[PDB]
């Protein structure tokens, strides 16, 4: 099964390119958005944790509106990555939920990222809320230190499906070359045996970069590239990412 | 591991080296292909001798080898007779295959020969020693066009190759499933990290296994085959595109 967001069909054809916008202020958000129009991406992720005024609703809303006005074609993914999973700042569970609910209610965003480890009650409720306002949910988990066993990676991914995620997502850090392969094996087992929707997976750092390139074969429906700045280790430039995906899609 | 130097090319260091296969039936085909390949961006030229129509006529093989060496002067030359039993273009008895390879060594025109792991241990050891005595490196190989053996069998084959004197163990396998591609890569990592004391070449064939032809720098395959115009195996991509991907991965 696939997920359609603003006419982009995720889980079909070549993996979709996502780029993260990281602006600290409304001014930086506007200039970054304008500059990003030159890049060949499919989905724009707004990394809200990089934004300085995250607790001022009116400010968050104004920035989302600015992005939506500059980037009118592409799906917009609203992602507050918590400090706990590699993000720039922390919020209370309540703050995090209200933030995402406000994004959903604004009509400015097509998708939201919800971290699996937020709490089942909270995730369930917010997934329900998102779906009531036609907003898709990428449910995510990140491990910046290590790569868990394939079985544990699959366990997380299925729990994400179980909680109603439109797109389960997991990012792990390899400590060895074999760790890259463990992430790929979990991806294939999930996609072939248990998934009834698209999944996004990556092995981070330069070492796992191959996981960001071969999703068309192995099962990851989307991959992140960098415009000028990486939002995670291992991301290569969007132009290079497009070149490689294109070669693999036509090879 | 110890690197392997063929002419001025150091295999096993930096980004994987690109090898391309020259396939011609007659001497006219060989000359025409060698001329067309002069423009191509590759590091090692493999002559797929099994494609050549008159491999049992020493003078014809020698002239063809000379023709290639006169046209392509600055790239190492790998002489490869891929046997029918290993998915090649013609069958030879063990004796004809060994005599052919020895003729290649004796010509002084080739820098490397490809010897198939399962030819027979006695024959392989004697031939490896002979190549070495004459300053010819040996890529030892094994191919399976239908399936991917267990990772542990793949590693055992690469290790047996080392045991038999191979300068560069090489194995090409075919994935039935996506997971099979990962099995080939697992075997590559295990071999390179725990057992290899020299460079190795590995690939999962077909489009499905193409990542194995691109990710050698991270996973441990020292060389990779691309196609100029016609592929010498399933899943090879054009040399231009192969170079582009390798450079991108090198600078990631």
Swiss-Prot record, chain A:
Keyword Amino-acid biosynthesis in annotation: yes
Domain of life (superkingdom): Bacteria
PROSITE patterns hit by this protein: DEHYDROQUINASE_I
Record annotation: effect of changing residue 231 to A: Reduces enzyme activity 50-fold
Entry binding sites for 3-dehydroquinate: 20, 45-47, 81, 212, 231, 235
Alphabetized CDD domains for the sequence: DHQase_I
InterPro entries: 3-dehydroquinate_DH_AS (IPR018508), Aldolase_TIM (IPR013785), DHquinase_I (IPR001381), Type-I_3-dehydroquinase (IPR050146)
Subunit structure: Homodimer.
PANTHER family in UniProt: 3-DEHYDROQUINATE DEHYDRATASE
Protein name as catalogued: 3-dehydroquinate dehydratase
Biological classification of the source: Bacteria, Pseudomonadati, Pseudomonadota, Gammaproteobacteria, Enterobacterales
Gene expressing this chain: aroD
């Amino acid at each position: 099964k696939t997920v359609t967001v603003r006419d982009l069909v995720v889980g079909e054809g070549a993996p979709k390119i996502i780029v993260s916008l990281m602006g600290k202020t409304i001014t930086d958000v506007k200039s970054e958005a304008l500059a990003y129009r030159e890049a060949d991406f499919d989905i724009l992720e707004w990394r809200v944790d990089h934004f300085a005024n995250v607790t001022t609703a009116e400010s968050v809303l104004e920035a989302a509106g600015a992005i939506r006005e500059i980037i009118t074609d592409k799906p917009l993914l609203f992602t507050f990555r918590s400090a706990k999973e590699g993000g720039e700042q922390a919020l209370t569970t309540g703050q995090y939920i209200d933030l995402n609910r406000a994004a959903v209610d604004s009509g400015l965003v097509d998708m939201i990222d919800l971290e699996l480890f937020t709490g089942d009650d909270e995730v369930k409720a917010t997934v329900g809320y998102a779906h009531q306002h036609n907003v898709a949910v990428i449910m995510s988990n990140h491990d910046f230190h290590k790569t868990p066993a394939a079985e544990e990676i699959v366990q997380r991914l299925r729990k994400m499906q179980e909680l109603g995620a439109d797109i389960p997502k997991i990012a792990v850090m390899p400590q060895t070359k074999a760790d890259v392969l463990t992430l790929l094996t979990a991806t294939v087992e999930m996609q072939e045996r248990y998934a009834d929707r698209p999944i996004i997976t990556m092995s981070m750092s330069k070492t796992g970069v191959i996981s960001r390139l071969a999703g068309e074969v192995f099962g990851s429906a989307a991959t992140f590239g960098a415009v000028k700045k990486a939002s995670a280790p291992g991301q290569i430039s969007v132009a290079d990412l497009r070149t490689v995906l294109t070669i693999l899609h036509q090879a």
